[PDB]
Amino acid sequence: TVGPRVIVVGAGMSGISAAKRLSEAGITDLLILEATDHIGGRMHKTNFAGINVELGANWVEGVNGGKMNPIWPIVNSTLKLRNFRSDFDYLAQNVYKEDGGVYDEDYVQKRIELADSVEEMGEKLSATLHASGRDDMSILAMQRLNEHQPNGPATPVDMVVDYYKFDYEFAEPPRVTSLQNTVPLATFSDFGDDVYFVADQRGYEAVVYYLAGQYLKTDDKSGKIVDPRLQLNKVVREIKYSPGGVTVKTEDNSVYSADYVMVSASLGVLQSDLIQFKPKLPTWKVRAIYQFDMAVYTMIFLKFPRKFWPEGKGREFFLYASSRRGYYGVWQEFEKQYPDANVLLVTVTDEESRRIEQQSDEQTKAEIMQVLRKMFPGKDVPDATDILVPRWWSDRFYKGTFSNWPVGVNRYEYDQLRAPVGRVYFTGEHTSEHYNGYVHGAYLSGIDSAEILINCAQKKMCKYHVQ
Numbered sequence: 001t002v003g004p005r006v007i008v009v010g011a012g013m014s015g016i017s018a019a020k021r022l023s024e025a026g027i028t029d030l031l032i033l034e035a036t037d038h039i040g041g042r043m044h045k046t047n048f049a050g051i052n053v054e055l056g057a058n059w060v061e062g063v064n065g066g067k068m069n070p071i072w073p074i075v076n077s078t079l080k081l082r083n084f085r086s087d088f089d090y091l092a093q094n095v096y097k098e099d100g101g102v103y104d105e106d107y108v109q110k111r112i113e114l115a116d117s118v119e120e121m122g123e124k125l126s127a128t129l130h131a132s133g134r135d136d137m138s139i140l141a142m143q144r145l146n147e148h149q150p151n152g153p154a155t156p157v158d159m160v161v162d163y164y165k166f167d168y169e170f171a172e173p174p175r176v177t178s179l180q181n182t183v184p185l186a187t188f189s190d191f192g193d194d195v196y197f198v199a200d201q202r203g204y205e206a207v208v209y210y211l212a213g214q215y216l217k218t219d220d221k222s223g224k225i226v227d228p229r230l231q232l233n234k235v236v237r238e239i240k241y242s243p244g245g246v247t248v249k250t251e252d253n254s255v256y257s258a259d260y261v262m263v264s265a266s267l268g269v270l271q272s273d274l275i276q277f278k279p280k281l282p283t284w285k286v287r288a289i290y291q292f293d294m295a296v297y298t299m300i301f302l303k304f305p306r307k308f309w310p311e312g313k314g315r316e317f318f319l320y321a322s323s324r325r326g327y328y329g330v331w332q333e334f335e336k337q338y339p340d341a342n343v344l345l346v347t348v349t350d351e352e353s354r355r356i357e358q359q360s361d362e363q364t365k366a367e368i369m370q371v372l373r374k375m376f377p378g379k380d381v382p383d384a385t386d387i388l389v390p391r392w393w394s395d396r397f398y399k400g401t402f403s404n405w406p407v408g409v410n411r412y413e414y415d416q417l418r419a420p421v422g423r424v425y426f427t428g429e430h431t432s433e434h435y436n437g438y439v440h441g442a443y444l445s446g447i448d449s450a451e452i453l454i455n456c457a458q459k460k461m462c463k464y465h466v467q
């Protein structure tokens with residue numbers, strides 16, 4: 001109403017957080033333009049076969065550690081969102097042979113232990129690397145170094161173990177991933193090694209909503225955010241920035257003025273042509289944008305006439321050691337989370353995600369049936385009655401699921417990513433210093449971006465030195 005005006009592009013986690021931090025400081029003249037018809041962004045639930053499941057973020061990652069993960073209190077104490085600790089101690093008993101049945105546990109255990117040791121030496125190595133990133137390498141290069149081979153895990157069991165250890169976490173193979181920025185990982189180093197599966201019918205998005213209703217006006221009766229400051233179905237298509245101020249044009253031809261703009265759209269959106277910047281963003285910034293990775297993590301859901309898979313102690317997570325690396329490999333059954341549901345969850349990432357998103361649900365269901373018959377022969381496995389294939393990559397407002405730190409990108413040029421250009425500020429998981437790719441990362445990045453601008457608006461200090 002009175003003071004500087006900031007336009008926040010996008011009402012995701014970091015978007016909502018940023019505006020909240022801005023409000024708190026006094027900058028209340030905010031306008032949040034959100035492309036979709038809902039806040040939450042990549043924190044989004046949907047109805048699959050009469051239950052609510054997550055399309056996007058599904059875990060609170062990093063719990064029980066030396067520092068409190070800011071999302072965990074909100075999830076466990078404040079909203080008391082239904083969630084369960086994920087236990088992976090029994091994967092050794094649950095790795096399926098490409099053709100028929102499981103491997104000898106004692107065998108698989110060796111391979112897991114071996115894999116863990118190679119990664120532990122990765123940590124030692126990573127701890128010695130110069131902070132300039134000068135002597136950084138891919139996770140694979142390290143793996144090769146320890147295993148004394150021209151290659152990383154090359155055999156069906158080893159690979160699915162490798163996939164589970166890395167791909168299943170970062171949504172890209174070890175060979176594209178920076179050793180120095182994932183091994184070890186601050187998310188786990190700081191907040192603990194535990195991850196917690198949110199399975200609450202309100203949605204994991206309830207966290208975003210909770211935060212949003214601490215500064216945005218909500219209807220006393222229904223609870224729906226009624227604040228005129230949040231505008232849904234507003235698709236920012238052009239940002240005009242000059243010494244004087246900023247213009248923000250949306251897709252319906254509205255043009256807005258403000259003193260500053262906070263961009264919370266994903267790295268993939270920035271990488272696309274969705275938001276045009278006039279004038280064009282400096283080279284240094286563009287090169288930072290296009291060198292970072294916007295990975296794709298696809299959570300394929302399936303429902304079945306009956307339950308043909310093992311349930312009980314250490315049965316939640318099972319692997320499929322395909323000879324075609326990353327082929328329908330990581331499986332999750334929901335006996336605890338959605339009792340009597342008959343839903344399985346297979347995760348694919350990266351190269352496979354792009355294929356699968358592009359093909360018909362039927363074609364996919366077909367492929368998955370085949371695999372499931374091989375995993376459980378001498379059982380009668382019914383065709384899946386329903387399939388869900390989240391198409392995040394294909395979606396213009398996301399163009400991926402989360403960022404991954406790639407080999408080549410050093411700490412400096414990562415900072416160029418978060419750096420502002422004029423009155424154009426950036427936020428989102430991909431700007432998060434130590435927690436890119438994560439809900440908390442997005443959440444904390446909101447606060448940091450906000451504070452950077454607040455420091456400029458109020459304290460009148462606006463030179464940002466990239467480091």
Ligand SMILES: Cc1cc2nc3c(=O)[nH]c(=O)nc-3n(C[C@H](O)[C@H](O)[C@H](O)COP(=O)(O)OP(=O)(O)OC[C@H]3O[C@@H](n4cnc5c(N)ncnc54)[C@H](O)[C@@H]3O)c2cc1C
Pocket residue numbers: 009010011012013014015033034035036038039040041042043055056057058059060061234235236237264265266269274275297298299392397398400401402427428429430436437438439440441442
């Ligand atoms: C499949 C998947 C699984 C994941 N797994 C985990 C996990 O379980 N645990 C965890 O901690 N994190 C995980 N994440 C990552 C986590 O979801 C993100 O780090 C976090 O949600 C990012 O929030 P954000 O505000 O940075 O981006 P977003 O949530 O994408 O916010 C951007 C918002 O801007 C909007 N938008 C984009 N373009 C425009 C525009 N042109 N105009 C106006 N609005 C625009 C979008 O609609 C969106 O609402 C997962 C993500 C996905 C999708």
Ligand SMILES: *[C@@H]1O[C@H](CO)[C@@H](O)[C@H](O)[C@H]1NC(C)=O
Pocket residue numbers: 063064076077
């Ligand atoms: C979450 O809440 C439960 C049940 O109220 C409580 O016992 C526990 O302290 C919390 N769990 C974690 C991991 O913080």
